[PDB]
Amino acid sequence: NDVARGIVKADVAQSSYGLYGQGQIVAVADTGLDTGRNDSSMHEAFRGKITALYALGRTNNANDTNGHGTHVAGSVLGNGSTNKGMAPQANLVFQSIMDSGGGLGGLPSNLQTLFSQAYSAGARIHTNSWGAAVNGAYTTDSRNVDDYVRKNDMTILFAAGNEGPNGGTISAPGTAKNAITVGATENLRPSFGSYADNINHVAQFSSRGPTKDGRIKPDVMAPGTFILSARSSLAPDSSFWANHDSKYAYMGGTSMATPIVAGNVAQLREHFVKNRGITPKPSLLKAALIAGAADIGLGYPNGNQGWGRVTLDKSLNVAYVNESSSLSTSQKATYSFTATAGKPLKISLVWSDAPASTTASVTLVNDLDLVITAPNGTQYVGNDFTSPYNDNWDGRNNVENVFINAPQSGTYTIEVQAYNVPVGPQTFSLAIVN
Ligand SMILES: [Ca+2]
Ligand SMILES: [Ca+2]
Ligand SMILES: [Ca+2]
């Protein structure tokens, strides 16, 4: 956590912006949380900051004999004396879904019930380091995720899966269009070896896009190898990559990368709410993270890294549109942005799409297109990274990007065009870094 904090610039968000996630509530659905009691017996990283602790997988027992869920929550918001999570003043809703058999039987049949329970407890961010290795398929779970986000103010995050490095290995519900799906890059702890020596390396095991219908997943990356975080007092050494002390230890996976981003979302959401006067929609939080993310060096578009590694301080200050307009087929929204040639210009369009059928060969329902015009007339189409940048249109993703490394100082025109919106109208968010 301490090293990941610096990589994703949560350190700047905390030190220069005051953002520790105070006021925000993150829900974590995972194995269990240390002793499983919300009292003084609880691990120092969470004691006193738990909104609710629910036992779903094993009635009357939310403890963590595995260690996975405790480490994960610790990365989101742990507030121990050491190895803090990214949003150490956020409060925790924890839903224990591990069953007696070691599986995830506490999940309800309808995932919407899971998210609703968390919502009623006050959580507005819901993070899930779990999934099924269905090679990019959009399942019932994926559908329910999408349905829920379109209808409710919940930002939902899912791990990409650990089946890399082959392409098309994204887990469900990580295949959901409306979730923030997170892959793992390496932490920088090179004394531990090749799995933690280059922050611009995708971790070998991180699942890789595209999804089954060709979409870019994961959406973003964060350090996920040799992550030092809260160690459940009931978990054995075998659960860890390495020991540290009796209260913290190392783990590695997309399960570790996802909560780092979840805590960053809590920091980001706090910023909008406290400092920017608005409650940002899940689609804006997602757009802001994408626009601020760093190309780890593979270029775009790319299912190994998605849109890149979270860089939180750039996301904080984006120029935005927060679902303030909705569009029907053939309509368009127009904005203008004065750019500065000194630094790159990144514009990202995200929408919380209507949920797909599990039998559709194409999951996108409503298709919006991003069209950018530079001061001198040059036009760019969302996700077209090959020159000429206006001849390849995107009909698959509900994230579209125009990224210009050496922008012209001057006013850029931004169009959001409704190409085909059968379940309309469709709103959207925009985030602009420059
Ligand atoms: Ca490496
Ligand atoms: Ca499009
Ligand atoms: Ca092109």
Walk across the major sheet and give the strand order. Answer: 2-3-1-4-5-6-7
By CATH reckoning, the class of the largest domain would read: Alpha Beta
The name of the CATH superfamily of the largest domain reads: Peptidase S8/S53 domain
Instruction: Give the class from helix and strand content and strand pairing.
Output: alpha/beta
Share of residues in helices? 10-25%
Largest sheet features = 7 strands, parallel
**What is the helix tally?**
8
The percent range for strand residues is: 15-25%
Order of helices and strands: HHEEHEHEHEEEEEEHHHEEEEEEEE
Per the CATH scheme, the topology name of the largest domain is Rossmann fold
Spatial extent as radius of gyration = 20 Å
Number of strands: 18
What small molecules does the structure contain? calcium ion
End-to-end CA span: 28 Å
CATH architecture type of the largest domain: 3-Layer(aba) Sandwich
Identify the overall geometry. globular
Number of domains: 2
PDB class: hydrolase
Keywords: alpha-beta hydrolase fold, jelly-roll beta-barrel, Hydrolase
Assembly: monomeric
Entry title: Crystal Structure of alkaline serine protease KP-43 from Bacillus sp. KSM-KP43 (oxidized form, 1.73 angstrom)
